Design a protein around this ligand. Structure first.
Ligand SMILES: Nc1ncnc2c1ncn2[C@@H]1O[C@H](COP(=O)(O)OP(=O)(O)NP(=O)(O)O)[C@@H](O)[C@H]1O
Lengths: 17, 311, 295
């Protein structure tokens, strides 16, 4: 992944969707 | 035997589900909490061939007046879903189970909307919410957005960089923080990692983020978020209610309509020229942290909009 | 350099992509083929903020005239980091779906637009059809054993399909209603329907016009038939309700000789029906795709 920290975690960066 | 006039879709452990149910009680209404996460094991759903034939835990719910849609928990990767052990065990049947649940709950929600239920953020809007399409819908409708490039081609990135200047990169759909596009990132070694998945490059806007809340074509407030850069040992976030020109208000309302949202927390950001570009409209925005740090009431207007549907 | 007027989304290894491309070639339009299976690792797509800034492999492809939308090894990736892999697939899917939504908004006639997925959710699809006055079988989606005991008691002998689709239709027999047998659905929802004793019929619709209808009666002996203009009307109405441009419907007749709509398919196959009943399906489809280019 180019955005390596995509899966690093309760994922909160997707809490508004 | 239950006042399913207002329905909150979400787990009762969701701080915003809690906030909305409490708001609704203070207004005199007892919401029905529809927790899809308990579907196969601890809930009963029966759908007839007629749109009105809907039975949850034995009771008929043909048409709520309004629904507050926090989350349907469709994939095991969502916010409120602790599905780690099940996915580590057998991820194929777990994805199957989540798809099985989702088709039924989406059927319920779509039946409700078809019956006239005012769904505060209907799932259909998902189509319009895909970012690379949302930003273009807005742009071609007259709203300013950042100079963007969603891509997997390093050459496109290099030419976009040479056209724009300072750039940031962030996920296409979401799931990680946006970062400044540094020189290290344009070296072949790691810019060739775009073959694994595309990413979104944008012009680095230097102004301040502003979170505008819109409910039923009316701006509730506009909160400026500032990163307190003064003391580096303890950076704090100062959030302040600010006044936005009526031009900005009408633009935000137009955007909410375009995408197809009733309740939306949209992020905008000003450039060097001090003018706002629309960053993104959220389909189930949060509001608690903003209420607290900015001393504003967002849950109140939401509960009132919901209750106004029952009348 | 290329036409990019008629676009076929799918893999060249697909028989249906092959047929459609052959019919468009034999008709004068060599179509652009968007083989999205190549997307991340091989081919390249770039979107700008302007809806027309769509670049596939360096060539700008804003606004095709028409699109035929047809369509991984990761078990290691799903057991090593499933959250990350699911997010990666969502990044890709998001960009591709964005391409299609942009074209549709630009004016492109996408034959089966992904926006139809909403209306296609089966448990909601049949309610859409019935609540708009169309004949549908008496149906019951449930995980409640008492609900299915009552449904059986009211409608009589009935059948059950998998909720989302994939398996064969089976008959609910008295032995299944026992506590042991019926309790299984406490966590295994299926769809129960009144058992229609007529003959299954597949009907194809394209741009508000029925193409053909085949009774699929031992080996498959599907044979072409002709149906009333009332049922033709009902079928095109159903397809306009669900929001499909090219659909392969399943309808079944009751004991009373009247047909009930069973199910519309987002992108039905035809290579196996057009050979077994000797009618032309791909032909009229290519005719519609080309007709859109005029306007
Ligand atoms: N063009 C830009 N220039 C500078 N900062 C940006 C830009 N676009 C987004 N950001 C930053 O990203 C934040 C907005 O989040 P956004 O990127 O829209 O969603 P996300 O972080 O991808 N995930 P989510 O918040 O769940 O949608 C803002 O606070 C900005 O700091």
């Amino acid at each position: 992944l180019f955005i390596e920290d995509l899966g690093k975690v309760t994922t909160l960066a997707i809490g508004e969707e | 035997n239950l006042d399913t006039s207002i329905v909150v879709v979400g787990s009762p452990d969701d701080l915003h589900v809690q906030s909305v149910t409490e708001g609704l009680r203070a207004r005199g209404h007892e919401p029905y909490v529809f927790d899809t996460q308990r579907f196969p094991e601890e809930m009963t759903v029966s759908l007839g061939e007629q749109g009105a034939s809907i039975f949850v835990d034995g009771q008929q719910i043909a048409r709520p007046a309004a629904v507050y849609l926090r989350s349907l928990y469709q994939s095991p990767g969502a916010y409120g879903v602790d599905a780690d052990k099940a996915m580590q065990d057998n991820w194929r049947r777990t994805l199957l189970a989540f798809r099985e649940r989702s088709t039924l709950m989406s059927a319920v929600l779509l039946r409700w909307e078809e019956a006239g239920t005012a769904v505060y953020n209907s799932p259909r809007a998902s189509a319009n919410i895909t970012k690379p399409f949302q930003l273009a819908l807005l742009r071609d409708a007259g709203l300013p957005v950042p100079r963007s490039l969603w891509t997997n081609d390093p050459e496109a990135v290099r030419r976009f960089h040479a056209e724009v200047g300072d750039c940031i990169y962030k996920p296409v759909a979401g799931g990680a923080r946006t970062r400044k596009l540094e020189a290290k990132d344009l070296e072949a070694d790691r810019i060739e990692r775009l073959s694994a998945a595309p990413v979104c490059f944008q012009e680095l806007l230097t102004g301040d983020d502003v979170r505008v809340y819109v409910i039923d074509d009316q701006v509730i407030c506009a909160l400026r978020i500032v990163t307190d850069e003064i003391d580096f040992r303890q950076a704090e976030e100062r959030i302040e209610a600010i006044e936005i020109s009526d031009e900005v208000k009408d633009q935000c309302v137009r955007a909410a309509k375009l995408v197809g949202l009733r309740y939306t927390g949209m992020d905008i950001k000003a450039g060097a020229d001090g003018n706002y570009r629309v960053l993104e409209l959220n389909a189930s925005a949060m509001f608690r942290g903003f209420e607290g740090r900015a001393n504003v009431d967002i849950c109140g207007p939401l509960c009132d909009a919901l209750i106004a549907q029952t009348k």
